[PDB]
Design a protein around this ligand. Structure first.
Ligand code: SF4
Ligand code: SF4
Ligand code: SF4
Ligand code: FCO
Ligand SMILES: [Ca+2]
Ligand SMILES: [Ca+2]
Ligand SMILES: [Ca+2]
Ligand SMILES: [Ca+2]
Ligand code: NI
Ligand SMILES: [S]
Lengths: 489, 279
């Protein structure tokens, strides 16, 4: 009694994604995730001036280019042997932090919300699934349904301007956005002035107000209507984080700390244990067993028998692990926003102080949205602090020279999850460049041992009571905020 | 009165052209979507998915045949029979599945369009996906049209990404022309098919640092005063109005902040590299 559903394009994610599920007895029983577009940045980068990489890699993705830029300039800093100044570190955090706010807001509203909110009856809001299980369908009190839907839709519309203001903030010290100019090996290219710090701060306060007063309340309200969506889209419950936003000059402390949580147990993150498999990916490896990124290879092969995706399959100690706000928030376990503490009590009867107090509810469709909203607030608190720490006039740039032969790795967290760039230099040129990105960890295919990627696994058990309107499949996928440009590069 | 119908397709893109469009002001994106264009298909933001999204796209391309703008973001990879970019799957009348390549999609939709607008350096000129080292046979819209012998009005709006003013301005000018061609002639294009309205000015000739350049006052590092030429600035060989318009609602621009990397030019990136070595 199995029925196959194939969704290509899976829209309202970044990039080219296909989702296939098998449904039996009203639930997903198998799944396949496929990235269908390849560019090969790791091949394109070879032979170039290593400094070019921090411009080239941003073109992996116009949603998260600051993450790639950050990873790249950190890899370069490492390879070139240069230490960034205090003000350079802070300035880089202000540039990147402004896009964390932009990316999460863009995601929840402009990618995720149309699975819950009924938009106006004009394209691109229509056509839509006939039985879409929206706020206007779920809430049986019609006035309340209309009011809640309008509340959500007005936030979607207002968020268009809020996200644009976030890009004014990125451009303040970043030059422009998408694709900043302001981060380079050795630091940042423009020293913050008192006037421009104040200008950033004024815009930031408007964004922060939206986050606290509109976004957080909408998310908790949404979850209180869709309580069933805290109980599905579970997956492996393994997460990894690399550390993001260094809070001191020796990169020992972060806003959100590195760590791994596998099979109910916390451990430290050890980069030696990352490897990529390609058994079901359109790539050839010179040796079996999966490859650590420091010896990674990018040899595309769309004819490879048995392969179904351009996404490689990263594993940590041979375990699939997911990444993103859920991962970071689980690993760090920060205190919840005052809004979250209040609304969890008021709307759900839940007493919660710290993220882990959500328990099983964290590992779900709605848990991923909650994690992302909470992290937006947490990042705003941090940006507010960094705006006080940044010193007008203090040097942000330190000179360097391209080394003959070197290696460097930049570790960070993109808004969608753990990110590293590995750079090897020979004869002052890029010899190898390997990118292990966020959505790569989430939207990967099966590894050589048949273990499903995190999105594939989280789809198992998702309810599909209406095969013609399989809304929970897209809801699960979009809860991960996938970026297939990043996943494949 | 009537809005311009748009089908926006993505090949080997990064979604940055779309994100830059979302940053529009005067008009802002809400007004663009509700008042200026009918964005009929756009994979990043549209409500429908899969079969429904594609069926809607093809329905619009039929109903509005010769009367919609085909917007293309990203390059078109031609190696391996187009299999480096699969844009969707079509379910025939018997249940069988067929993947659609970017090549197939553009070959299908371009002849149905009123005009094709290649937004971004990738679609206009090949850009980063078509740069040295790529193995995907990545191609621009103009080169694909030439190979396919497709004669369809084509306007290029390059930049990596383009400024939203360039994309909005070009689309509005094109639509105005269609509505009244003698009152609103098409914008004059240069030899690379991009509007002189936005790409006629040389950055360097219009640069506020030109006085410093003339006096040989060059910034020793990014955070020192002077012209940016020694830091790698490609303003001298780049044609765009960034010096006047600036970026992100006038907040900053590449040259003030750092250097111009020549992102609008047909030889970006290879002819503009290394980025931090002077021209
Ligand atoms: S032109 Fe640049 S910003 Fe636009 S799709 Fe290509 S890489 Fe992205
Ligand atoms: S080289 Fe660059 S910074 Fe100097 S005057 Fe020309 S465009 Fe301006
Ligand atoms: S200043 Fe140069 S790099 Fe910046 S947007 Fe304009 S053309 Fe592109
Ligand atoms: N955020 C983001 Fe992009 C992804 N996935 C990266 O890295
Ligand atoms: Ca195939
Ligand atoms: Ca890679
Ligand atoms: Ca209006
Ligand atoms: Ca032909
Ligand atoms: Ni991305
Ligand atoms: S980012």
């Amino acid at each position: 009694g199995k029925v196959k559903i194939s969704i290509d394009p899976l829209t309202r994610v970044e990039g080219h994604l296909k989702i296939e599920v098998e449904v039996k007895d009203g639930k997903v029983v198998d799944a396949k995730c496929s990235g269908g577009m390849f560019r090969g940045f790791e091949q394109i980068l070879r032979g170039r001036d290593p400094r070019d990489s921090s411009q080239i890699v941003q073109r992996i993705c116009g949603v998260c280019p600051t993450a790639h830029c950050t990873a790249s300039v950190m890899a370069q800093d490492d390879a070139f042997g240069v230490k960034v100044t205090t003000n350079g570190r802070i300035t880089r955090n202000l540039i990147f932090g402004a896009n964390y706010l932009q990316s999460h807001i863009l995601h929840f509203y402009h990618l995720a919300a149309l699975d819950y909110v009924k938009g106006p009856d004009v394209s691109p809001f229509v056509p839509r699934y006939a039985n879409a299980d929206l706020l206007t369908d779920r809430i049986k009190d019609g006035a309340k349904a209309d009011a809640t839907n309008t509340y959500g839709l007005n936030q979607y519309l207002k968020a268009l301007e809020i996200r644009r203001i976030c890009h004014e903030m990125v451009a303040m010290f970043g030059g422009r956005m998408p694709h900043v100019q302001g981060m380079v090996v050795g630091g940042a290219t423009e020293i913050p002035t008192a006037d421009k710090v104040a200008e950033y701060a004024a815009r930031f306060k408007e964004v922060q107000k939206f986050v606290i007063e509109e976004y957080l309340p909408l998310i908790y309200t949404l979850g209180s209507v869709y309580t069933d969506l805290f109980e599905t889209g579970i997956g492996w419950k393994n997460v990894i984080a690399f550390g993001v936003f260094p809070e001191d000059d020796d990169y020992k402390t972060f806003l959100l700390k590195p760590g791994v949580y596998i099979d109910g147990k916390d451990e430290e993150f050890d980069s030696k244990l990352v490897k990529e498999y390609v058994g079901h990916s359109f790539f050839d490896h010179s040796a079996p067993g999966g490859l650590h990124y420091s010896v990674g290879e990018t040899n595309p092969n769309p004819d490879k028998p048995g392969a179904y995706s351009f996404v490689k399959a990263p594993r940590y100690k041979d375990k699939p692990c997911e990444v993103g706000p859920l991962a970071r928030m689980w690993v760090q376990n920060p205190e919840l926003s005052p809004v979250g503490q209040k609304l969890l009590k008021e709307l759900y009867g839940i007493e919660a102080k710290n993220f882990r107090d959500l328990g099983d509810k964290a590992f779900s469709i709605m848990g991923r949205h909650v994690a992302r909203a909470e992290e937006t607030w947490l990042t705003a608190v941090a940006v507010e602090k960094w705006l006080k720490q940044v010193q007008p006039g203090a040097e942000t740039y330190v000179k360097s020279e391209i080394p003959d032969a070197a290696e460097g790795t930049g570790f960070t967290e993109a808004p969608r999850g753990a990110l590293l760039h590995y750079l090897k230099i020979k004869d002052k040129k890029i010899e190898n460049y390997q990118i292990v990105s966020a959505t790569l960890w989430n939207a990967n295919p099966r590894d050589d041992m048949g273990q499903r990627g995190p999105i594939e696994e989280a789809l198992i058990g998702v309810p599909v009571p209406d095969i013609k309107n399989p809304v929970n499949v897209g809801r699960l996928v979009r809860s991960y905020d996938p970026x297939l440009g990043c996943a494949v590069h | 009165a009537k809005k311009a119908p748009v089908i926006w397709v993505q090949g080997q893109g990064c979604t940055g052209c779309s994100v830059s469009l979302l940053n529009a002001v005067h008009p802002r994106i809400k007004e663009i979507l509700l008042d200026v264009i009918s964005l009929e298909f756009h994979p990043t933001v549209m409500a429908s998915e899969g079969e429904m999204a594609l069926a809607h796209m093809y329905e619009i391309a039929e109903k509005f045949n010769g009367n919609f703008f085909l917007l293309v973001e990203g390059a078109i990879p031609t190696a391996k029979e187009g299999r480096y970019c699969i844009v969707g799957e079509t379910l025939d009348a018997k249940g069988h599945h067929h993947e659609v390549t970017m090549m197939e999609l553009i070959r299908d939709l371009a002849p149905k369009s009123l005009a094709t607008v290649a937004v971004g350096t990738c679609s206009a000129y090949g850009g980063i996906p078509a740069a040295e080292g790529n193995v995907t046979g990545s191609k621009s819209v103009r080169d694909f049209f030439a190979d396919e012998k497709i004669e369809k009005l084509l306007v290029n709006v390059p930049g990596c990404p383009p400024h939203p003013d360039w994309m909005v301005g070009t689309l509005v000018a094109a639509w105005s022309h269609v509505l009244n061609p003698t009152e609103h002639p098409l914008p004059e294009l240069d030899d690379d098919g991009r509007p002189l309205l936005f790409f006629g000015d040389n950055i360097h000739e219009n640069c506020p640092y030109l006085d410093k350049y003339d006096n040989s006052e060059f910034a020793e590092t990014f955070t020192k005063p002077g012209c940016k030429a020694e830091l790698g600035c490609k303003g001298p060989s780049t044609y765009a109005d960034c010096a006047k318009r600036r970026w992100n609602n006038g907040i900053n621009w590449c040259v003030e902040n750092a250097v111009c990397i020549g992102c609008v030019e047909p030889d970006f990136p290879d002819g503009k590299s290394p980025f931090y070595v002077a021209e």
